[PDB]
Each structure stands twice: as structure tokens, then as C-alpha cells.
Design a protein around this motif. Structure first.
Motif, PDB file in Angstrom:
ATOM      1  N   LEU D  21      19.813  38.208  28.940  1.00 16.51           N
ATOM      2  CA  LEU D  21      19.294  38.782  28.101  1.00 16.51           C
ATOM      3  C   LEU D  21      18.433  37.694  27.068  1.00 16.51           C
ATOM      4  O   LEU D  21      18.984  36.950  26.514  1.00 16.51           O
ATOM      5  CB  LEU D  21      20.375  39.976  27.397  1.00 16.51           C
ATOM      6  CG  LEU D  21      20.379  41.263  27.539  1.00 16.51           C
ATOM      7  CD1 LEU D  21      21.882  42.052  26.295  1.00 16.51           C
ATOM      8  CD2 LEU D  21      19.579  41.614  27.986  1.00 16.51           C
ATOM      9  N   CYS D  22      17.021  38.370  26.736  1.00 20.06           N
ATOM     10  CA  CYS D  22      16.004  37.269  26.244  1.00 20.06           C
ATOM     11  C   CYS D  22      16.278  37.290  24.117  1.00 20.06           C
ATOM     12  O   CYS D  22      17.561  37.983  24.292  1.00 20.06           O
ATOM     13  CB  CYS D  22      14.924  37.495  26.525  1.00 20.06           C
ATOM     14  SG  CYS D  22      14.473  38.812  25.096  1.00 20.06           S
ATOM     15  N   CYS D  57      14.794  38.352  31.339  1.00 21.05           N
ATOM     16  CA  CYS D  57      15.406  39.389  30.272  1.00 21.05           C
ATOM     17  C   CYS D  57      15.382  41.017  31.696  1.00 21.05           C
ATOM     18  O   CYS D  57      14.756  41.284  31.931  1.00 21.05           O
ATOM     19  CB  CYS D  57      14.824  39.728  29.362  1.00 21.05           C
ATOM     20  SG  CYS D  57      15.723  40.711  28.208  1.00 21.05           S
ATOM     21  N   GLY D  64      15.250  34.834  29.844  1.00 20.59           N
ATOM     22  CA  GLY D  64      17.196  35.470  29.276  1.00 20.59           C
ATOM     23  C   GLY D  64      17.385  34.207  28.576  1.00 20.59           C
ATOM     24  O   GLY D  64      18.055  32.959  28.868  1.00 20.59           O
TER      25      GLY D  64
END
Ligand SMILES: [K+]
Ligand SMILES: [K+]
Ligand SMILES: [Mg+2]
Ligand SMILES: [Mg+2]
Ligand SMILES: [Mg+2]
Ligand SMILES: [Mg+2]
Ligand SMILES: [Zn+2]
Ligand SMILES: [Zn+2]
Ligand SMILES: [Zn+2]
Lengths: 101, 56, 118, 105
Positions: D21-22, D57, D64
Motif C-alpha cells: 500500500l502506498c 499499491c 507501495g
RNA sequence: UGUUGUAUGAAAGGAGAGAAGGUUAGCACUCCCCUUGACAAGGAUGGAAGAGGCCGGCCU
RNA sequence: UCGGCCUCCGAAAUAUCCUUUUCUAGCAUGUGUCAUAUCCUUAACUCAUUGUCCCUUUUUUUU
RNA sequence: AUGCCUUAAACUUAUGAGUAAGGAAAAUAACGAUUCGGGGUGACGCCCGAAGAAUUUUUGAGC
């Protein structure tokens, strides 16, 4: 900008309570309306002395005569007929279209 | 704005028109000579210039 | 918003014996299944999916049962899309909970093995 | 996401790739989109980390910066077992935002 | 062979500085003071009250 | 022929009042519906982007 | 709930750009064309099609 339904209701009640010289107090009740717009809306359209009925024959005759007399001067004409100048104007144009036929 | 009060007795109305005319003369004369002072440079106060502009 | 509260409260008390409150609240959540607005409709479905894991697949099947073959398509497809959610999440546990359907003239519908007696 | 009905998950058979996840999406759940109580690590299917896309992401698709988890509630409901949770279409909201800013700017 | 013969300022603890939407400007009417050499000017516009009738209450 | 103005102090801005001690000041006594605006609300709804489009002209960097 | 001054103010009463989805009113369009067939619906709604002179009195069987 344009006048909603509920805004007109607020404006009528607020004039009924605060009168006609306190447009800054009345503008505080509305959303995004200034004092000048409140006043203009009242005299143009919302005032009870404005008569929104059909035009009599007499009232039309005075309109055609006075529009010949002082051409394009609707604020001068309009209290002599007892309609709003905008009302006087659009009804004049109506009759001119009607005479074109 | 034209002032009429329909019920009001005429002794009272005559007295009121008398004293309003007196105050009007006091107001207008003061306007007249404060403008002369503003033009000649005698006043330096800015609130008196604002009041005279309003009266004028 | 109350259905969202039921969804989240339902999953917290999983395993702790609070099923009487949750079953009580199911009695209030359940008539809202015929709502049509999508936000309200997905909050209700979330509440029921939370309740399946807290009061069990058996109760949720007992609620659906009468309307799966109801005459109106309106009641029927709403009821069928609750059934599918129970079926996906708990397909194995429902084996013990299905009702008994009797045999008709040419097809047999009794699960005779479960009827076995030792 | 739960806020966008037109978004669509990949749902293929997930693999050994870990989804990430970013910065914008850090700390939230991929399914129900919550901020609290992380229970399990997200695995993405092979195609979704192919090539250049390796490590982007899951939820939006940006660079990410941390691992993605499922929350506890999605674990208990076994929402973590449906497949690859990578979002495969941008949707109407993302596209509209681009054209709106580009019109203005 | 005592005691309420009072006040100012400060500290501590509380209240909080006019304008029938908000932010504010002031000058006075009465009587209560403070700064001041004041017939000046300030102290939040210095502060505090402000329609009529009957016996704090009631009526318009 | 000469020609030389001034110089600074306070107030109108950081309130006021009450309670208990502390410092000091001053005293005084005592044999339902078509087709249109609007209003309210919902979803921890978002605040631009750079990610080979190279595809195309009889078209081809010379011993 | 007090008089006056430039309505005391020649002061302001602000609230960006979008995505998806609901509720309520205002406004507005129609009322009985009967039965039959078909579409549709849990059911209706709704929709598509079709069509005062004749036996007991006063307009005579009387001549
Ligand atoms: K005074
Ligand atoms: K003041
Ligand atoms: Mg003073
Ligand atoms: Mg002041
Ligand atoms: Mg002052
Ligand atoms: Mg002063
Ligand atoms: Zn992201
Ligand atoms: Zn989750
Ligand atoms: Zn995938």
C-alpha cells in the motif's frame, strides 16, 4: 443568485417584522444575498402592493398612450399606471406583438 | 419622506412642525459654514469632513 | 446507521454468549429488508452478514425459509440474495440445518442417511 | 472499495506475492477499508505483480510503501479468502477528477 | 482596664468588557465615584437605572 | 552691503468586578403520475496526472 | 423597553472543484367507454388492440 421558494418566504416574513429600512438585518437571514438584492427582490416582485392580476382595458389604454408620450422611460411611466416597470414593459411588448397580427 | 400622522391633534402637530423647522435651520447653517472652513483649509479633522459630506 | 452499529457490535461479541441481545436486534433489523435505497440496503446486508457469524447460520436460514418460494418476485429475489450470502459464508454448516422436504411422485427428497438410527 | 460500487476486484487465485500500500493508503484494510485492528497479510495473484507492477499499491496503484493487511472483521467473516483483492479498473470517480483538474489547470 | 474606626493596591481563586445577525465608534441626560492645577480631557461610550395603571406581584 | 524658522510631556489600548489572605493609608470613642426547479441527507467518497500511443513517406548514415 | 451624531460605521453578513446514491415538498398532467382478446403483475395498477307508430291504452282492423 436566483430566488428560491424558501428564500422568498424568509424575505416576506423578515420585512413584515423589521420593516423596510433595515436591509442589512434582513440580509443576515438569507444565504449569499446582499442587502441590495433583498431590496430589489422586495420591490420588484414580493411587495403586496404589486398587482399580479390581468390587465384591464383602461390600464392598457393608458399604457399605449404613455408609451407613445415618453418613449422608453418606464420608471417614469410605471407609477402612473400602477404596475411595476418590468410588468409594464413586458405587457407593452405583448400588445405590440398582438397588433402585428 | 413626507410625514403625516393621521390622528394627531393640530396643536401638537403645529408645535412639531415648528421645532423641526428650527432644527433644520440649525443643521443647514452648520453645513453651510463647515463647508467654507473645509474649502479654506481651516479644519484638519477628518470626522468633520465626513459629517459635512453626509449632510451635503 | 443503526444497522452499521449492529454489524460491528455483532462481530465483537462473537464467542461470548451475547446471542439474546443480538437475536432481539435481529427482530428489528429484519423488516428493513424490503428497503430499496442502496445505502440503507447495503448496511442491512452488512448487519446480517455480521449476525450470521454471531448467532449462527441456523437462525439466519430460519428467517429466510418462508420467502424463498413466495409468490412475488419482489419478496423472492431479496430473500434469495440473503440466502446466497449465508450459503457462501457457511455452506458446510447448513447441512445440519436444512428442513425436511417430502418425496413427491417421481423424485425423492428425503435425506435418508441422517434418518438412520443406531 | 466499499465507497465505490463500480470498482472490481481481480479475484484470481492468490499466490506468494505480498500486496502493498502506498502512503495514501497506509494503515487501511483492502476490503472494508477500515483503519483499525490488522489481522492478516494480503497476497496477490501472479499477474498482478507482473513486471513493472511488482510492488505497487493494491487499492489505488501508486508506489507501495508498506504491506497490506486484512482487518480482524474481514478475517472472521473470511473475506480474506475470496481471491486477489487488487482493484482492476480505475472507475468513474478517478477519471472524472483527472478531466476536471485538466480542464481547470 | 482588648476588640466591627475604615479604605487602596497586590497575590491566589472565580465572574468576563453597550449596539433587537457579527464586529465595533462615540457624545450626553440623573447619582455614584477615580486620575487631574482644572470652566479641559480621560477612567469599557467611566459605571449603574430609565413606558403607563393598581396592591416584589398583576393587567395593556 | 548685511537678512539664518523648529528640538517635549501624559491621556484617548491590553478592561472591570467579586471572595479570602498579605502590605500599606486614614480615622474615632468611653464618670398515485407524467414532466420541471428547489430544499434536506447519505457514502472516514476524492483533490489532477507523466504510465513504449511511435503506429506514419518506394526512404534505407556513405568505401 | 433612552436621547443624539456621517440610517452612528463612507464596516460585512464568508462558504472552492467534483464522484456515486437517497428522502421530502413546491410546481405540474389527467378523472367514470362500456365489455372482449392479448402483454404484464402476488393482486390490482398499468399497457397494446376491436365494436316515447310493433301485441295491455295516444298514431286505429276499420268501413
Ligand atoms: K456621563
Ligand atoms: K465604545
Ligand atoms: Mg468621558
Ligand atoms: Mg474603544
Ligand atoms: Mg475611549
Ligand atoms: Mg473622546
Ligand atoms: Zn494506494
Ligand atoms: Zn476489513
Ligand atoms: Zn490479481
Amino acid at each position: 443568485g436566483v430566488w428560491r421558494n424558501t428564500e422568498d418566504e424568509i424575505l416576506k416574513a423578515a420585512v413584515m417584522k423589521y420593516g423596510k429600512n433595515q436591509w442589512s438585518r434582513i440580509a443576515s437571514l438569507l444565504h449569499r444575498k446582499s442587502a441590495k438584492q433583498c431590496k430589489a427582490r422586495w420591490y420588484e416582485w414580493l411587495d403586496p402592493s404589486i398587482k399580479k392580476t390581468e390587465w384591464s382595458r383602461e390600464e392598457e389604454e393608458k399604457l399605449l398612450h404613455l408609451a407613445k408620450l415618453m418613449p422608453t422611460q418606464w420608471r417614469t411611466i410605471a407609477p402612473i399606471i400602477g404596475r411595476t416597470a418590468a410588468q409594464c414593459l413586458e405587457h407593452y411588448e405583448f400588445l405590440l406583438d398582438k397588433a402585428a397580427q | 419622506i413626507p410625514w403625516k400622522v393621521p390622528g394627531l391633534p393640530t396643536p401638537i402637530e403645529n408645535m412639531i412642525l415648528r421645532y423641526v423647522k428650527a432644527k433644520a435651520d440649525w443643521w443647514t447653517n452648520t453645513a453651510h459654514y463647515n463647508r467654507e472652513r473645509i474649502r479654506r483649509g481651516a479644519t484638519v479633522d477628518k470626522t468633520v469632513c465626513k459629517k459635512n459630506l453626509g449632510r451635503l | 446507521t443503526a444497522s452499521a452499529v449492529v454489524q460491528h457490535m455483532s462481530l465483537g461479541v462473537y464467542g461470548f454468549g451475547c446471542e439474546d441481545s443480538l437475536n432481539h436486534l435481529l427482530n428489528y433489523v429484519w423488516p428493513n429488508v424490503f428497503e430499496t435505497s442502496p445505502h440503507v440496503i447495503q448496511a442491512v446486508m452488512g448487519a446480517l452478514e455480521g449476525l450470521r457469524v454471531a448467532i449462527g447460520p441456523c437462525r439466519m436460514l430460519q428467517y429466510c425459509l418462508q420467502g424463498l418460494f413466495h409468490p412475488a418476485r419482489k419478496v423472492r429475489d431479496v430473500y434469495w440474495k440473503i440466502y446466497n450470502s449465508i450459503y457462501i459464508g457457511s455452506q458446510d454448516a447448513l447441512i445440519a440445518h436444512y428442513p425436511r422436504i417430502y418425496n413427491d411422485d417421481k423424485n425423492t427428497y428425503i435425506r435418508y442417511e441422517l434418518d438412520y438410527i443406531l | 472499495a466499499k465507497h465505490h460500487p463500480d470498482l472490481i476486484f481481480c479475484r484470481k487465485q492468490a499466490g506468494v506475492a505480498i500486496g502493498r500500500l502506498c502512503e495514501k493508503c497506509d494503515g487501511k484494510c483492502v476490503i472494508c477499508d477500515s483503519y483499525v485492528r490488522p489481522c492478516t497479510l494480503v497476497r496477490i495473484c501472479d499477474e498482478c505483480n507482473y513486471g513493472s507492477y511488482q510492488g505497487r499499491c493494491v487499492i489505488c496503484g501508486g508506489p507501495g510503501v508498506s504491506d497490506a493487511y486484512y482487518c480482524k472483521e474481514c478475517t472472521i467473516q473470511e473475506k480474506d479468502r475470496d481471491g486477489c483483492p487488487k482493484i482492476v479498473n480505475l472507475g468513474s470517480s478517478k477519471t472524472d477528477l483527472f478531466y476536471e483538474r485538466k480542464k481547470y489547470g
